[PDB]
Amino acid sequence: MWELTILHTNDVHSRLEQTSEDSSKCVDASRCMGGVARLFTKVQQIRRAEPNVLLLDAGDQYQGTIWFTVYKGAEVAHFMNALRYDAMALGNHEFDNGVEGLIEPLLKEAKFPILSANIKAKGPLASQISGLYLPYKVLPVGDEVVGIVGYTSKETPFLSNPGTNLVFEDEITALQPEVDKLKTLNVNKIIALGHSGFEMDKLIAQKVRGVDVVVGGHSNTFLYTGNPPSKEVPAGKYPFIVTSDDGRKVPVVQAYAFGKYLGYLKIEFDERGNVISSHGNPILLDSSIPEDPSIKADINKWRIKLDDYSTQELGKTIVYLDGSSQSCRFRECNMGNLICDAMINNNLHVSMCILNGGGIRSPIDERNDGTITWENLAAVLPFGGTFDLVQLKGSTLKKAFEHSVHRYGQSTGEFLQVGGIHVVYDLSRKPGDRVVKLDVLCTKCRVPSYDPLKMDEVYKVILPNFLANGGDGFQMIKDELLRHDSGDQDINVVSTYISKMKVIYPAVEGRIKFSLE
């Protein structure tokens, strides 16, 4: 009777300009995808056709490319406003530059509500931040109203830098009272829009009474009903139907990441706000959808300040630097090896390296005459961390390599890329006993060679400060390390190594392997 068209995106990660098929920098414009200008054309095409439409963003617009390194969120605000988003949920990467880095660039400049019900501000901050983000928003859609209630990952204090003032409550505990409040105001059509991952989105649908639809992000999930249009493999059907505890069929959606797909769900409601049915599929923002001229011309104006990073050629590559999550979080990926070889070459003392696959966040292409610029490296290592030195026991590395594949097969970034280590896993074995072989490049030896790792011996390892501090559940490294020394800036390490090598050709050479039985 009353149809609503929800449009949505998540984990856009500063991909304001059209990208390549792999979400890295665009070279061949004839086959490029995504970008805010192309997203605007589909959005308007839909707005003309459908009278009741909501554009919503389910978190992580911050951090990803040189755009955010330079504009620090002012670009997210300006272009999201230009596209006319109806609402947005806070994701963990909105806190990467502290609470000040979220407040000044985005919250003050955004012309649309920013939502998160489970973030409670306490102490001195509570007074300034009040009203700049809300737990919900009752938005008028035509003759009707739709309630939108936000949620952010409760893991944000560990994953980002939100500070001691913000308290991140359980998603389901904080959402139910805001939903019950919306229902008491006869707001019967209600959407849960947040950033906690597909598993938490599925629990929110199941447990939170009243929630009619769940838009979400954080897990880069791709759902699709039928034959998909690109290389992304669907995790389930679009929408993913969750039968609630109160027998209600609740649809759950996600639109992959990098602004490559525009999520699209048509929900058909009745008079009492019940969902009769729904259907849709994420729309591939490919070359067939033209970029809007007004937006593309405005992107080109903002691009001028970023071209000082695009000018300097750091080196050259005669191979595809596979810095994708589908390789780096599952197998040995040549980007992981390159970064580990630059890490080891930087300090040289130390021969071993361990790098989390989730820290490698973009590939680099070889087809632009193989050139590598600061802009390419700014997408691979956008966090600006440091490659620190740590002294570790053999049992601590064994425990780390066991953590590296404890929940293998979920696209989790804890999978380790290595240098100076030869590891062999057996996924048939139980979690905590999957490392069958682990040889390491000896230090106390005249001719280095790969000998078995000994539990009672001490080894020096160069790794990101994220891992040294316990990130990605690597609590054993933080607790059991014997020494920790702060290293150089991650981009400056790989940038120096590339200029030293001039031409690079990293390969997948058997540092990580998997056994049959």
Contact residues: a copy of itself, CB under 8 A: 318-320, 322, 334, 348-349, 351, 366, 422, 441, 446-450, 500-503, 505, 507-510
Rule CB under 6 A: which residues touch ligand NYW?
11, 60, 92-93, 159, 218, 220, 356, 358-359, 383, 385, 412-414, 464, 466, 472
Of 176 and 220, CB closest to Zn ion: 220
Of 346 and 356, CB closest to ligand NYW: 356
Least distance in angstroms from the C-beta of 193 to a copy of itself: 38
In 3D space, the residue among 205, 220, 336 whose CA is nearest the CA of residue 278 turns out to be 205
Residue 92 annotated as binding site: yes
Query: What sign results for the dihedral spanned by CA atoms 236, 198, 335, 439?
Result: negative
Provide the terminal-to-terminal Cα distance of the chain, rounded to the nearest Å. 58
Which of Zn ion, ligand NYW, a copy of itself, none does residue 505 bind to, with CB < 5 to 8 Å depending on kind? a copy of itself
Which one of residues 218, 329, 403, 434 is an interface residue with Zn ion (CB under 5 A)?
Answer: 218
Site stretch for Zn ion (CB under 5 A), options 58-66, 113-121, 273-281, 290-298: 58-66
Q: How many CB atoms lie within 10 A of CB 45?
A: 12
Site stretch for Zn ion (CB under 5 A), options 57-65, 143-151, 277-285, 488-496: 57-65
The footprint of Zn ion on residues 8-27 (CB under 5 A) is 11
Residue 11 annotated as binding site: yes
Which one of residues 17, 57, 60, 472 is an interface residue with Zn ion (CB under 5 A)?
Answer: 60
Of 3 and 155, CB closest to ligand NYW: 155
Separation of alpha carbons 122 and 104, rounded Å: 19
Least distance in angstroms from the C-beta of 376 to Zn ion: 19
Residue 334 annotated as binding site: no
Of 79 and 466, CB closest to ligand NYW: 466
Separation of alpha carbons 162 and 121, rounded Å: 10
Query: What sign results for the dihedral spanned by CA atoms 314, 318, 319, 324?
Result: positive
Least distance in angstroms from the C-beta of 317 to a copy of itself: 11
Which of Zn ion, ligand NYW, a copy of itself, none does residue 472 bind to, with CB < 5 to 8 Å depending on kind? ligand NYW
Tokens of 124: 């001195």
Residue type, 69: T
Of 38 and 93, CB closest to ligand NYW: 93
- HSE on the CB side for 471, CA within 13 Å? 23
Site stretch for Zn ion (CB under 5 A), options 50-58, 180-188, 218-226, 434-442: 218-226
Work out the widest C-alpha separation in the chain, in whole angstroms: 80
In 3D space, the residue among 14, 16, 19, 5 whose CA is nearest the CA of residue 284 turns out to be 19
Which of a copy of itself, ligand NYW, Zn ion, none does residue 296 bind to, with CB < 5 to 8 Å depending on kind? none
H/E stretch holding 275 = strand 275-280
Do residues 193 and 115 touch, judged by C-beta distance below 8 A? yes
In 3D space, the residue among 461, 278, 496, 228 whose CA is nearest the CA of residue 374 turns out to be 496
Of 92 and 495, CB closest to Zn ion: 92
Residue 511 annotated as binding site: no
Residue 112 annotated as binding site: no
Residue 13 annotated as binding site: yes
Which of a copy of itself, Zn ion, ligand NYW, none does residue 375 bind to, with CB < 5 to 8 Å depending on kind? none
Least distance in angstroms from the C-beta of 220 to ligand NYW: 5
Phi, psi of 253 (to 5 degrees): -125, 155
Question: Could you please report the per-residue DSSP string of 225-268?
Answer: SSS-SSSPPPSB-SSEEEE-TTS-EEEEE-B-STTSEEEEEEEE
Do residues 33 and 316 touch, judged by C-beta distance below 8 A? no
Tokens of 201: 């989105």
Least distance in angstroms from the C-beta of 93 to ligand NYW: 6
Q: Please list the residues that pair with 2 across neighbouring strands.
A: 269
- The size of the interface with Zn ion (CB under 5 A), counted in residues, is 5
Do residues 168 and 152 touch, judged by C-beta distance below 8 A? yes
What's the DSSP call for residue 272? T
Residue 298 annotated as binding site: no
Of 221 and 327, CB closest to a copy of itself: 327
Least distance in angstroms from the C-beta of 151 to Zn ion: 12
Do residues 294 and 43 touch, judged by C-beta distance below 8 A? no
In 3D space, the residue among 329, 359, 336 whose CA is nearest the CA of residue 471 turns out to be 359
Do residues 243 and 255 touch, judged by C-beta distance below 8 A? no
Do residues 405 and 434 touch, judged by C-beta distance below 8 A? yes
Q: What is the CA radius of gyration of the chain?
A: 24
Which of a copy of itself, ligand NYW, Zn ion, none does residue 319 bind to, with CB < 5 to 8 Å depending on kind? a copy of itself
Of 176 and 325, CB closest to Zn ion: 325
Residue 286 annotated as binding site: no
Of 133 and 415, CB closest to a copy of itself: 415
406 alpha carbon, distance to own chain's centre:
21
List residues forming the annotated binding site for AMP: 329, 356, 361, 383, 466, 472
List residues forming the annotated binding site for Zn(2+): 11, 13, 60, 92, 195, 218
In the complex, which residues of this chain contact Zn ion (CB under 5 A)?
11, 60, 91-92, 218
List residues forming the annotated binding site for IMP: 329, 356, 361, 383, 466, 472
List residues forming the annotated binding site: 11, 13, 60, 92, 195, 218, 329, 356, 361, 383, 466, 472
